[PDB]
Amino acid sequence: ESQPDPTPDELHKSSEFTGTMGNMKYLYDDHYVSATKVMSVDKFLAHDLIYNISDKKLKNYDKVKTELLNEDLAKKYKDEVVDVYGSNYYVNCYFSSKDNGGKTCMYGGITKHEGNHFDNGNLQNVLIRVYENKRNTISFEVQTDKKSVTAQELDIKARNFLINKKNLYEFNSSPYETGYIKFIENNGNTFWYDMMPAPGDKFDQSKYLMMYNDNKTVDSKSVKIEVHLTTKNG
């Protein structure tokens, strides 16, 4: 059923990462694609959808391609009016079938608009508990207007806060050696994401963000979230 917690040896270690941690920071530091009530207009590969979404803030794009885990998911949302929220990238973002106004790429992040908001139009607060070397040091809330929200949206908001509050990611490296965010649903199901880059000297943004392609959603009103960091080295 649910995924078992991380084994000690499998968590990515920042000490084994030789690239620029700033490239991971970029993906979560006040960085995200957002849109409401849109419908896809085109496709590239069988598992993706293309939307006309403009970079409101910093005019960097007018088109967005989101890749999904499979062809079924893409077909399911193809003609639906949806809301979008996710972390985008530009390096190795591929479009056109020889040819096929900037463009940007991302994974998952879509939810149906209809019936997915709160009656009183208020926002739902989600508590995030932070653990450092097995100690709950701080806890804070992030918000969403969606009853059923993607795990990606909640993750992004949580890391954005920790970047500023705890300097989660810096340009050169990170004060933490290990890190993973865990979700606990009200039906008992659990799952987690590794918050550190794979070992080596070159961070692959596209490959990392791919973990969101399942378009996983959770009930904002009842889900629990825990961030587990260690400085177990230094």
Which stretch, 112-120, 171-179, 182-190, 198-206, contacts Zn ion (CB under 5 A)? 112-120
> C-beta of 128: minimal distance to Zn ion in Å?
23
8 Å CB contact between 193 and 180: yes
Site for Zn ion in 151-190 (CB under 5 A): none
> C-beta of 78: minimal distance to Zn ion in Å?
18
Instruction: Indicate the residue among 145 and 194 with the shorter CB distance to Zn ion.
Output: 145
Q: Is 185 annotated as a binding residue?
A: no
Q: Is 80 annotated as a binding residue?
A: yes
Which stretch, 38-46, 75-83, 98-106, 169-177, contacts Zn ion (CB under 5 A)? 75-83
Tell me how many residues contact Zn ion (CB under 5 A): 2
Q: Is 228 annotated as a binding residue?
A: no
Per CB under 5 A, the list member of 23, 51, 66, 83 interacting with Zn ion is: 83
Which stretch, 41-49, 77-85, 182-190, 199-207, contacts Zn ion (CB under 5 A)? 77-85
**Does residue 221 bind Zn ion (CB under 5 A)?**
no
**Does residue 113 bind Zn ion (CB under 5 A)?**
yes
On the CB side of 78, CA atoms within 13 Å amount to: 14
> C-beta of 219: minimal distance to Zn ion in Å?
16
Cα–Cα dist 215/143, whole Å: 19
Q: Is 47 annotated as a binding residue?
A: yes
**Does residue 224 bind Zn ion (CB under 5 A)?**
no
> C-beta of 143: minimal distance to Zn ion in Å?
15
Assign 3-class secondary structure to the chain: CCCCCCCHHHCCCHHHECCCCHHHHCCCCCCCEEEEEECCCECCCCCEEEECCCCCCCCCCCEEEEECCCHHHHHHHCCCCEEEEECCECCCCCCCCCCCCCEEEEECCEEECCCCECCCCCCEEEEEEEEECCCEEEEEEEEECECEEEHHHHHHHHHHHHHHHHCCCCCCCCCCCEEEEEEECCCCCEEEEECCCCCECCCCHHHHHHHHCCCCEEECCCCEEEEEEECCCC
Residue ranges for the binding site for Zn(2+)?
A: 9, 47, 71, 80, 83, 113-114, 117
- Binding positions for Zn ion, rule: CB under 5 A: 83, 113
Residue ranges for the binding site?
A: 9, 47, 71, 80, 83, 113-114, 117
